[PDB]
Amino acid sequence: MANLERTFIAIKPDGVQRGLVGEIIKRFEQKGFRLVAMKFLRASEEHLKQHYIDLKDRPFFPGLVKYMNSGPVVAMVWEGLNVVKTGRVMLGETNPADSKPGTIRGDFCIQVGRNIIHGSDSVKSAEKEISLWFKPEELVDYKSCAHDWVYE
Amino acid sequence: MANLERTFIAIKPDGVQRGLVGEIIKRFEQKGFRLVAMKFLRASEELVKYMNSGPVVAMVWEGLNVVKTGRVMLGETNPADSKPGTIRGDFCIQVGRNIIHGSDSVKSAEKEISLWFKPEELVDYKSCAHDWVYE
Amino acid sequence: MANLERTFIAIKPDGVQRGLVGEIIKRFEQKGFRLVAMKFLRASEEHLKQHYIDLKDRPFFPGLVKYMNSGPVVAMVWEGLNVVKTGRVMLGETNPADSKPGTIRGDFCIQVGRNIIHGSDSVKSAEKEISLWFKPEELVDYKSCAHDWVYE
Amino acid sequence: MANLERTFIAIKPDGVQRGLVGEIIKRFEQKGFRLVAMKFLRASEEHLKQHYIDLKYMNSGPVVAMVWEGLNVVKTGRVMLGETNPADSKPGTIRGDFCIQVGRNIIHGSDSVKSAEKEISLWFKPEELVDYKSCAHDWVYE
Amino acid sequence: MANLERTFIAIKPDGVQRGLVGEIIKRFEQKGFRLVAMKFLRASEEHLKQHYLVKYMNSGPVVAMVWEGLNVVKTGRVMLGETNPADSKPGTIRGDFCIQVGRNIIHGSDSVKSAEKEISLWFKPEELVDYKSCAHDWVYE
Amino acid sequence: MANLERTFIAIKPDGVQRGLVGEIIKRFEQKGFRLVAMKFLRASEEHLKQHYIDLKDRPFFPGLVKYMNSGPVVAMVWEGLNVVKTGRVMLGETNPADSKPGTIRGDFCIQVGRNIIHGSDSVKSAEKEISLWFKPEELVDYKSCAHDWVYE
Ligand SMILES: [Mg+2]
Ligand SMILES: [Mg+2]
Ligand SMILES: [Mg+2]
Ligand SMILES: [Mg+2]
Ligand SMILES: [Mg+2]
Ligand SMILES: [Mg+2]
Ligand SMILES: [Mg+2]
Numbered sequence: 001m002a003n004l005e006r007t008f009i010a011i012k013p014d015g016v017q018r019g020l021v022g023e024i025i026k027r028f029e030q031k032g033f034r035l036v037a038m039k040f041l042r043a044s045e046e047h048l049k050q051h052y053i054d055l056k057d058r059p060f061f062p063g064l065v066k067y068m069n070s071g072p073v074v075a076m077v078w079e080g081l082n083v084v085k086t087g088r089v090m091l092g093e094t095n096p097a098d099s100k101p102g103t104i105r106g107d108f109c110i111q112v113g114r115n116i117i118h119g120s121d122s123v124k125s126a127e128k129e130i131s132l133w134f135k136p137e138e139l140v141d142y143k144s145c146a147h148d149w150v151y152e
Numbered sequence: 153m154a155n156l157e158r159t160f161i162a163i164k165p166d167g168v169q170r171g172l173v174g175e176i177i178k179r180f181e182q183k184g185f186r187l188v189a190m191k192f193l194r195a196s197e198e199l200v201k202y203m204n205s206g207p208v209v210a211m212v213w214e215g216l217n218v219v220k221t222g223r224v225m226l227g228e229t230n231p232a233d234s235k236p237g238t239i240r241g242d243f244c245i246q247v248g249r250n251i252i253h254g255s256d257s258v259k260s261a262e263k264e265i266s267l268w269f270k271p272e273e274l275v276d277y278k279s280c281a282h283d284w285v286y287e
Numbered sequence: 288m289a290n291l292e293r294t295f296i297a298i299k300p301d302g303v304q305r306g307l308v309g310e311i312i313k314r315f316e317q318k319g320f321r322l323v324a325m326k327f328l329r330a331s332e333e334h335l336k337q338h339y340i341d342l343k344d345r346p347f348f349p350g351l352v353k354y355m356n357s358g359p360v361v362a363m364v365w366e367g368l369n370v371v372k373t374g375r376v377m378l379g380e381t382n383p384a385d386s387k388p389g390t391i392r393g394d395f396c397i398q399v400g401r402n403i404i405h406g407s408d409s410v411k412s413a414e415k416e417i418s419l420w421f422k423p424e425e426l427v428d429y430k431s432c433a434h435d436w437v438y439e
Numbered sequence: 440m441a442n443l444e445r446t447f448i449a450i451k452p453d454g455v456q457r458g459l460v461g462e463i464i465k466r467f468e469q470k471g472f473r474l475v476a477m478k479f480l481r482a483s484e485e486h487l488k489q490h491y492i493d494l495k496y497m498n499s500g501p502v503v504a505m506v507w508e509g510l511n512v513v514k515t516g517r518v519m520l521g522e523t524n525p526a527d528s529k530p531g532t533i534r535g536d537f538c539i540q541v542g543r544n545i546i547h548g549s550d551s552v553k554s555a556e557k558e559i560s561l562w563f564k565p566e567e568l569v570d571y572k573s574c575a576h577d578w579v580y581e
Numbered sequence: 582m583a584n585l586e587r588t589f590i591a592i593k594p595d596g597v598q599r600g601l602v603g604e605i606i607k608r609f610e611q612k613g614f615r616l617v618a619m620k621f622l623r624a625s626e627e628h629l630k631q632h633y634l635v636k637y638m639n640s641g642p643v644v645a646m647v648w649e650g651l652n653v654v655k656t657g658r659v660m661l662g663e664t665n666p667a668d669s670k671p672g673t674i675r676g677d678f679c680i681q682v683g684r685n686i687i688h689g690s691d692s693v694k695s696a697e698k699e700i701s702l703w704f705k706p707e708e709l710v711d712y713k714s715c716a717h718d719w720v721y722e
Numbered sequence: 723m724a725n726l727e728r729t730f731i732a733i734k735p736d737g738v739q740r741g742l743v744g745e746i747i748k749r750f751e752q753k754g755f756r757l758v759a760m761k762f763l764r765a766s767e768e769h770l771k772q773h774y775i776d777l778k779d780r781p782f783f784p785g786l787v788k789y790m791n792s793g794p795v796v797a798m799v800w801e802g803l804n805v806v807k808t809g810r811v812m813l814g815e816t817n818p819a820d821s822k823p824g825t826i827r828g829d830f831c832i833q834v835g836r837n838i839i840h841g842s843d844s845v846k847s848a849e850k851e852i853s854l855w856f857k858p859e860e861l862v863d864y865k866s867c868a869h870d871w872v873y874e
Contacts, residue, residue, distance in 0.1 A: 441647065466677070469678055470679070470680065471599075471678070509680055510681060511667060511680075515680070518670075518671065519671055521671070528669070529671065530672065531670065531676070531677075532671045533669035575598065577685060578594070578599055579595070579599070579600045579680055579681065580681055580683075580684060581635065581636045581681060581683030581684055
């Protein structure tokens with residue numbers, strides 16, 4: 001079913017440091033998506049290199065990896081219809097300069113190197129990142145009491 | 153006069169069920185529109201089983217270009233296209249459960265108001281901030 | 288059953304005029320109570336003298352009635368366990384001067400003659416106010432999707 | 440130092456189900472406490488509390504387990520939750536704002552420092568407790 | 582008239598630094614009080630309090646304000662919560678936002694006479710703005 | 723460095739009268755911009771004529787000046803990367819009819835003559851307006867504790 005699509009959302013160290021964890025989680029809860037998994041950790045450099053491997057030939061990659069390791073992140077899996085694309089809409093443009101008011105980035109940050117949050121860009125990237133950051137024992141299954149009111 | 157335009161806004165059963173009535177009314181109040189009428193009822197059958205499935209909040213709101221601006225504030229009818237910052241953009245996912253309905257035109261609005269409300273349920277009063285919302 | 292207890296809540300003309308209808312309804316929704324009935328009207332002075340009949344000899348009664356007729360009110364019936372007592376706690380003390388931060392009155396008003404809201408003071412008074420303001424066909428029955436998570 | 444005290448906070452399945460995870464975390468963040476650990480798991484209140492009364496808990500469901508740090512965070516956390524029985528909780532507290540019945544009181548917090556250390560030992564591995572410094576620490580503490 | 586009482590409220594550097602100016606102002610506005618004056622300046626808490634142990638803040642930004650309304654001195658104090666955040670209730674500014682008395686983010690006058698003294702000391706008379714709120718008749722009888 | 727750009731934001735008399743000062747300041751604070759200057763005043767007509775001199779001969783110029791003088795305003799200077807353009811995005815379109823939900827004007831007002839807020843349209847206008855409304859002693863300097871999490 002399309003309603004079982006999952007995406008990986010990570011609140012970056014600046015999101016934690018500036019006290020935005022609750023605000024972000026609230027936006028996803030109130031949209032109607034279901035929290036599947038969540039943990040709080042300092043990701044190692046090797047872990048972050050595997051996560052950002054597609055960008056290793058980019059000039060900012062050394063900085064990116066350093067900053068993603070400079071504090072703890074909140075790693076999460078969320079489930080719902082088109083949650084990948086829709087979550088990307090909710091985050092706003094990757095460059096906060098282009099993000100619109102009402103989006104997470106549009107409301108809460110300024111510079112691309114401090115854009116507080118990451119979300120999977122595709123279903124395939126989503127499954128790879130979910131597998132990288134979480135094990136199957138860490139995924140929680142339940143039915144939201146409001147399911148029949150969110151979905152037809 | 154253009155400032156006395158009215159629109160019909162109905163919160164559907166999924167909006168009542170998920171606890172969104174207060175937020176919706178708040179967005180309309182803080183925009184500067186005036187509540188003209190409101191009632192809470194079960195939608196009788198005159199799809200359409202689904203709107204009887206629960207209660208609806210029927211409302212009439214007044215203000216300049218309130219029909220179109222209301223539609224903007226609701227967001228696109230299909231939540232998949234709704235922008236963050238709109239009611240549907242913030243709170244729902246699927247068109248069959250898009251929690252709210254607003255009139256699409258002035259004539260539609262006056263038809264819906266006649267159909268859902270009696271004329272005496274439409275309350276006339278002046279907002280104490282009217283001179284600060286309108287010139 | 289104790290969970291089917293109902294109370295009458297009325298947002299007074301100053302609550303409407305100062306744009307607090309949404310905030311108040313939101314507080315009752317998020318507490319877990321079920322909206323049973325709601326309408327918007329300018330109550331007649333006759334109606335208001337019947338509502339406040341117990342205070343007809345008080346010095347402020349004529350002014351109270353006039354002010355309650357000077358604008359529209361939002362009349363509501365809400366349902367839940369100990370909703371009369373608990374709704375009164377949520378409103379704050381009837382005299383805003385003694386209302387606490389976190390309550391409706393404590394957060395939003397100042398003077399007893401402009402205390403923006405009324406709630407039934409007892410189950411008795413609640414049922415007579417419900418009968419005065421609403422017809423039984425105007426009372427809406429449905430089950431909340433979150434009922435099993437609000438009540439054991 | 441007293442600023443290094445910790446408490447255990449668990450959002451129960453009714454809190455997850457009614458969409459309150461963000462609100463709760465936000466109240467703790469804005470108070471000034473530091474999130475030390477957090478994970479999402481399935482756990483039953485029934486089985487955790489089955490060895491109890493000696494002579495009506497929620498079944499297995501999703502819970503958010505957390506460890507929070509700060510001065511007097513155990514007691515102040517309990518104040519922020521409000522009374523365990525929502526009927527006695529004051530508006531402005533988590534339970535005062537969001538729930539009605541004690542069997543569905545959406546959240547749990549440790550009632551004493553040693554209880555808190557025990558619960559943290561029970562729920563978390565030592566390596567899940569993350570050490571970092573809040574950028575606002577010097578503005579929360581003198 | 583008692584409805585013209587005034588109080589002095591100062592947001593301290595920890596309140597500015599933690600991004601709380603808007604929330605605090607919003608609580609006073611929504612309560613129904615009228616903003617009379619406001620300015621943003623650099624001030625040292627030490628030099629001000631040692632001008633007439635908990636370690637006070639050095640020179641930093643403060644938002645100084647004057648608010649008007651019935652019983653605003655006392656009610657303002659209630660809305661701030663107890664001076665020691667350890668005793669502040671949820672729903673108050675200090676109950677919601679801070680932990681330690683030396684970083685209690687805000688100050689309010691403790692009495693009408695204190696309020697008038699501090700208003701004179703921090704503000705010029707022409708900085709006190711007189712206007713009528715459009716909702717005044719719905720806040721006061 | 724580009725992160726020190728400053729813009730002039732003014733909350734107009736209708737913004738004060740409808741109780742929006744806190745909401746607006748909150749949106750700027752939570753975005754990551756730094757408050758540099760702020761005061762509360764009734765601007766004189768001649769001050770307002772200087773401020774809007776570029777519009778000195780339009781049909782509405784006389785009305786504008788008289789309304790901007792009809793109540794107090796909150797004048798402010800805010801600092802950050804691209805604060806001029808980004809602040810204009812946050813305000814929404816000058817005409818509320820075109821402002822989008824999530825913007826200040828989109829969320830809070832309706833008509834161009836009552837658009838509750840003003841922001842500098844360019845850096846040059848920003849430097850001119852900041853000098854007109856504030857003297858250098860009124861500009862307050864400090865480093866945000868979160869600077870290193872807002873800027874790379
Ligand atoms: Mg990045
Ligand atoms: Mg849209
Ligand atoms: Mg529709
Ligand atoms: Mg009495
Ligand atoms: Mg039903
Ligand atoms: Mg418990
Ligand atoms: Mg003090």
